[PDB]
């Protein structure tokens, strides 16, 4: 009884999360061919940290977490250790000691359309930066000015989430990208996710 890791369910999901509400799937007790993903022409970003992508088929991990969401092309650079900006600061934060791979591809053909796609949101305002792998789905009115908001959206009192409103004719930096982050867990425990 050897299970194939369900990476298809992650990369080929019909629906992707907004980055503020990023999805996590835990992958365990299974075999994966990472070489097939790494050697795929489908991905414009495949960047690994703490491990060599060429060795992945020879390693075992205690778990793999697959996080996925949509951001703009010009924000994919923020999905890396040690980065700053609205996405790394307020939406999805990798730790300095990250062991894992960041995978991205252009999704303009699925995630934009004539009239705009307003479904994908991001957090624009927050009182402090996210901790690594923190998810914030709260919607407290953000006080930007001197007047207390008392929970009321208005002048200098901001709802903290905004829509990308992806427009299909915008250039590549504005276009939606689907991102999958694979975190390779290294607990001092039996390692249940292996290569072939």
């Amino acid at each position, epitope marked *: 009884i050897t299970n194939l890791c369900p990476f298809g369910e992650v990369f080929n999901a019909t629906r992707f999360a907004s980055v503020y509400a990023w999805n996590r799937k835990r992958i365990s007790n299974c075999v994966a061919d990472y070489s097939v993903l790494y050697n795929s022409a489908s991905f414009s970003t495949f960047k690994c940290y703490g491990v060599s992508p060429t060795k992945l088929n020879d390693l075992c991990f205690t778990n793999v977490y697959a996080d996925s969401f949509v951001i703009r092309g010009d924000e994919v650079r923020q999905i890396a250790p040690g980065q700053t900006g609205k996405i790394a600061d307020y939406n999805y934060k990798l730790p300095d000691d990250f062991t894992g791979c960041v995978i991205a591809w252009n999704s303009n053909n699925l995630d934009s359309k004539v009239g705009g796609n307003y479904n994908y949101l991001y957090r624009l305002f927050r009182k402090s930066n996210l901790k690594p792998f923190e998810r914030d789905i709260s919607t407290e009115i953000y006080q930007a000015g001197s007047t207390p908001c008392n929970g009321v959206e208005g002048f200098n009192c901001y709802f903290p989430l905004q*829509s990308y409103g992806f427009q299909p004719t915008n250039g590549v930096g504005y276009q939606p990208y689907r991102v999958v982050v694979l975190s390779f867990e290294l607990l001092h425990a039996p390692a249940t996710v292996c290569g072939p």
Partner: nanobody
Amino acid sequence: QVQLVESGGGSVQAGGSLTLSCVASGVTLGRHAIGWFRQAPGKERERVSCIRTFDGITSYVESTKGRFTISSNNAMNTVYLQMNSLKPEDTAVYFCALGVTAACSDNPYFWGQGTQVTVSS
């Protein structure tokens, strides 16, 4: 602070077309309602069109439906009013107006200086 930078408008012949642009600064489009009002000679300032930049949903008044289409490009912080099938009675000062909520039905808070549109018969 918030500024609405308006451009476009001027003189056009009846049945012609114009495009007004409104660029917001000091705010990022993607949450708030933003739209167009106009004031024609002898008439009170009135609603023309509005778009919710949170969800792209547009709203119109009886006189503007079909001929005018409001659109946003949130990444460009720009909204557009494409004015087609223009008539002399469309002659007015057109104002970009930005809300402090997501709802088009709410009252505008920030106003542009306005742009003259003159339609000749």
